[PDB]
């Protein structure tokens, strides 16, 4: 209000009054594979809700790729929120909060940030490409985060204009895409109530370039508006599947009348669209005005003079109109904030739904306690001040209202992370222009000013002097792991504080960015890939810090493991020479580390469930199965600590006094690692004898923890240590002829091809392969250059694999600037990483 804004089809007063009714709000995130049409849709909708903001005839106005690099690269880099009022098929209006998410596999963190504050997902799938890598990854992520899933099969015009498939085969292609999505959903979810089918209204067909968007119901409504006497809802139930129309009986049967009879979808939906497009693009001068007369569209004379693409856009816009099918989909199959509040609190709130504050939050009552969760941070173009962005799950936030901001480490006993701040202004975020408001009720998305100071990634904003028992929302769980690592250093050491400030700012911007300072005074940035780090450095050098920053060569993060059991049972004693621990280290069973990290097992379980799980899944006896102490460096680390101390040999009651310290020592030791200060993975540590001093003045504190860490290191070093590379999963789409070239490019970088397969209904092929992360820099460029741009690849982290060599072997001599043979890659990876970290040149294997 009182802000100069573009004129809309609606009026902002209606938008403001809709925000109070939480049953007319839909918090939706648009996600899909890269370049699958997710952005026109937003303008393809902004235009329909903004008469003056139109797309250029020869250039598409992205309107949500508002960034510089977004506009030149043409690649979605950051999520852009859009709040619009969209009419329904029945004429009703709902307030839509849409999250436009990037489709590149490197920027999945933005997608998770959008998924946190959303109640439903609209998955965009190219009709020609089909289900690609990121489509599967986002389906898994969405059904895991307990979000309603709907599908929009975009770019259906490619079936007509590019591939020129017969309408029946276009129907087969669409049905195959829907079936693939259904199979993926059933794979990643147990309950059946997420069946996707256009009969249920779950799936929409669209072509954003030409302003086409219809469900079965919307097309049946077009028929009904033309011929009044039909009931479009019952008509829509017969427009998909193997149901054929019988024109003699005027009834729809499950059996085709005679022969050469087409399915209902082809006869009534696909064939008219084929004919419209064919008329417009082939007979614009000859027989277009007549067909336009038949459909009831009247185009003015200067309008018929347009080029073929704008003319097709205009004709389809006249025929179809607004995107009512999309709104029908998202109203029927995406819960309102009021209804979807309960799963959101169940999943993303640390206090659980059962908590008293959890109940008031699950009601989504806007007169309750304030509970706002922010997941994105948007920087003004000056790059000085940020604006937090998130949804108000309860209560109502006001401009000028003092608030209590809780960080990610805030617990009910450690209340030092919270900080009081004052809200400056509130903007209802639209893609480009912010509409300033005075208050935002529950269930809405708000851009907050004044709370950006004490938060890094995520926050929970509550009210001071109330909500004493207010916990936080769980930090985002990302799809990938940041592996690619680069080091930064200012050109002039005098301006180091400037680079540090810029590093803090980029850490605020990118949700999954991890900036750390190593022991050697080296500043390190972790990213997902080359494009990710490229854009991070572009922001760092140009947006936040105006200084010159040197960049080191890209490198990956390694992990350390073992391959047999320790030869001699290690032991280590405290400086008091009274407390002594004996441990051995052995490799974990295959597939157990992944179970641990993926929370298939939790130490929060009672010893009974832990024991039965281990017994039935990995052949563990009850004694060892219930003997688990800790679960790696974190609560879900890929390492296990087990006590084999016999009750007779050691008194278990006294062992319990040092259990809580041996656990911490083991966690810290696995966090650091002895080889090259890297994480330890897939290692099982068994305690064999723990001699404990009776006097508590000798044990506990800073005496037993270092002994535990040292014994962990020594036990690890007996069993043959190995290094671990991160392995990337590459999916390549390329024509048939360039498949061999893809093989040739992969073979040079230690690549191993898993499978190549045709894309059904498309002339291309998909090659899926595994490549080491370190042997992947420039792989995309090599593939796109050797194939003259006809092959494109997206790489994503998959798993950890052992480096061929042996890290602890001094016999190998390495020259400074030559690639090494595989037989001793591990030795180089180990010593060079040690030199980079600033440690000694070699380890000291001992007891």
């Amino acid at each position: 209000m009182e802000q100069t804004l573009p004129v809309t089809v609606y009026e902002m007063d209606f938008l403001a009054d809709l925000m109070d009714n939480s049953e007319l709000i839909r918090n939706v995130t648009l996600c899909g594979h890269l370049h699958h049409g997710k952005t026109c849709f937003v303008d393809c909708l902004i235009e329909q809700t903004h008469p003056e903001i139109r797309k250029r005839y020869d250039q598409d106005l992205c309107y949500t790729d508002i960034l510089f690099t977004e506009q030149e690269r043409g690649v979605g880099i950051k999520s852009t929120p859009v709040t619009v009022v969209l009419p329904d098929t029945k004429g009703k209006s709902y307030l839509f909060n849409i999250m436009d998410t990037p489709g590149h596999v490197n920027f999945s963190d933005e997608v998770t940030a959008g998924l946190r504050i959303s109640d439903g997902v609209v998955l965009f799938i190219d009709a020609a490409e089909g289900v690609m890598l990121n489509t599967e990854r986002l389906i898994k992520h969405a059904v895991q985060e307990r979000l309603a899933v709907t599908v929009c099969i975009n770019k259906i015009d490619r079936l007509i204009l590019e591939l020129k498939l017969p309408p029946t085969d276009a129907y087969y292609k669409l049905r195959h895409i829907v079936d693939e999505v259904n199979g993926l959903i059933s794979m990643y979810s147990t309950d059946e109530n997420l069946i996707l089918s256009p009969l249920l209204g779950n799936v929409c067909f669209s072509s954003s370039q030409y302003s086409i968007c219809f469900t079965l119901g919307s097309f049946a409504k077009i028929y009904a508006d033309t011929f009044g006497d039909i009931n479009y809802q019952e008509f829509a139930k017969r427009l998909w599947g193997d149901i054929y129309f019988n024109p003699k009986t005027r009834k729809f049967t499950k059996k085709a009348p005679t022969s050469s009879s087409q399915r209902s979808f082809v006869e009534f939906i696909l064939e008219p669209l084929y004919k419209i497009l064919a008329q417009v693009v082939g007979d614009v001068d000859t027989s277009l005005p007549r067909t336009l007369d038949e459909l009831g569209i009247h185009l003015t004379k200067e309008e018929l003079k347009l080029n073929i693409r704008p003319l097709l856009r205009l004709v389809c816009k006249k025929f179809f109109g607004e995107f009512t099918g999309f709104v029908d989909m998202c109203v029927q199959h995406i819960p309102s904030p009021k209804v979807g509040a309960k799963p959101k609190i169940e999943h993303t709130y640390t206090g659980g739904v059962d908590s008293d504050l959890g109940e008031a939050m699950s009601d989504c009552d806007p007169d309750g306690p304030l509970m706002c969760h922010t997941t994105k941070m948007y920087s003004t173009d000056d790059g000085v001040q940020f604006h937090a962005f998130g949804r108000v799950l309860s209560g109502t936030i006001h401009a000028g209202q003092p608030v209590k901001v809780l960080g990610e480490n805030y617990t009910l006993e450690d209340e030092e992370d919270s900080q009081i701040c004052t809200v400056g202004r509130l903007w209802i975020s639209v893609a480009r222009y912010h509409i300033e408001v005075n208050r935002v009720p529950a269930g809405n998305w708000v851009l907050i000013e004044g709370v950006d100071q004490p938060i890094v990634k995520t926050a929970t904003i509550t009210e001071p002097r109330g909500n004493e028992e207010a916990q936080i929302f769980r930090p985002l769980k990302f799809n990938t792991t940041s592996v690619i690592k680069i080091a930064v250093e200012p050109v002039n050491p005098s301006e180091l504080p400037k680079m540090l400030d810029g590093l803090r700012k980029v850490n605020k911007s990118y949700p999954s960015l991890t900036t750390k300072v190593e022991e050697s005074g080296e500043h390190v940035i972790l990213g997902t890939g080359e494009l990710y780090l490229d854009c991070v450095m572009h922001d760092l050098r140009k947006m936040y810090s105006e200084i010159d920053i040197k960049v080191a060569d890209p490198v990956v993060t390694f992990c350390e493991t073992v391959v047999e059991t320790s030869s001699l049972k290690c032991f280590a004693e405290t400086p008091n020479k009274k407390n002594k621990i004996t441990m051995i280290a052995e490799p974990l069973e295959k597939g157990l580390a992944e179970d641990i990290e993926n929370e298939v097992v939790q130490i929060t379980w009672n010893r009974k469930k832990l024991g039965e799980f281990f017994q039935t899944k990995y052949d563990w006896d009850l004694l060892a199965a219930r003997s688990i102490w800790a679960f790696g460096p974190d609560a879900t680390g890929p390492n296990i600590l087990v006590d084999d101390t016999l009750p007779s040999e050691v008194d278990k009651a006294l062992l319990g006094s040092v259990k809580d310290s041996i656990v911490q020592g083991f966690q810290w030791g696995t966090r650091e690692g002895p080889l090259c200060d890297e994480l330890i993975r897939n290692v099982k540590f068994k305690i064999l004898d723990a001699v404990v001093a009776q006097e508590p003045l000798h044990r506990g504190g800073g005496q037993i923890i270092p002994t535990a860490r040292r014994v962990v290191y020594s036990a690890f070093l007996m069993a043959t240590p190995r290094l671990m590379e991160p392995y990337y999963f590459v999916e390549v789409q390329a024509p048939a002829d360039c498949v061999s070239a893809v093989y040739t490019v992969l073979a040079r970088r230690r690549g191993h091809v898993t499978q190549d397969a045709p894309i059904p209904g498309s002339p291309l092929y998909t090659i899926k392969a595994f490549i080491p992360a370190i042997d992947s820099f420039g792989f995309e460029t090599d593939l796109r250059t050797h194939t003259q741009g006809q092959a494109f690849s997206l790489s994503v982290f998959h798993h950890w694999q052992i480096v061929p060599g042996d890290p602890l072997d001094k016999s190998i001599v390495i020259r400074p600037l030559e690639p090494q043979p595989a037989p001793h890659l591990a030795r180089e990876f180990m010593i060079k990483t040690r030199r980079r970290k600033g440690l000694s040149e070699d380890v000291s294997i001992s007891k």
Binding site: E11, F14, D17, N21, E23, P87, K90, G91, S93
Partner: protein
């Protein structure tokens, strides 16, 4: 040309609070769930006042459209795009 504006406005009222006065002088105030082209209103959480003035609570109500005298709609619908 076919369906009048007031019916559209009534369609917009779904989900809000509405008070309903039938020919029997009975006042039904509650959350309007659904409406049709005719005034058939499916509406919920009813605070119902009879002609004498007795007030009752009735969670689900479906009123025949022919038997509505007038319907009082929330004031924010005055800003509906359809009312412009």
């Amino acid at each position: 040309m076919s369906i009048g504006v007031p019916i559209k406005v009534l369609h917009e009222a779904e989900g809000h609070i509405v008070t309903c006065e039938t020919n029997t002088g009975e006042v039904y105030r509650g959350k309007l769930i659904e409406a049709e082209d005719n005034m058939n209103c499916q509406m919920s959480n009813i605070t119902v006042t009879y002609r004498d003035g007795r007030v009752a609570q009735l969670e689900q109500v479906y009123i025949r459209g022919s038997k509505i005298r007038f319907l009082i709609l929330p004031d924010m619908l005055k800003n509906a795009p359809m009312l412009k």
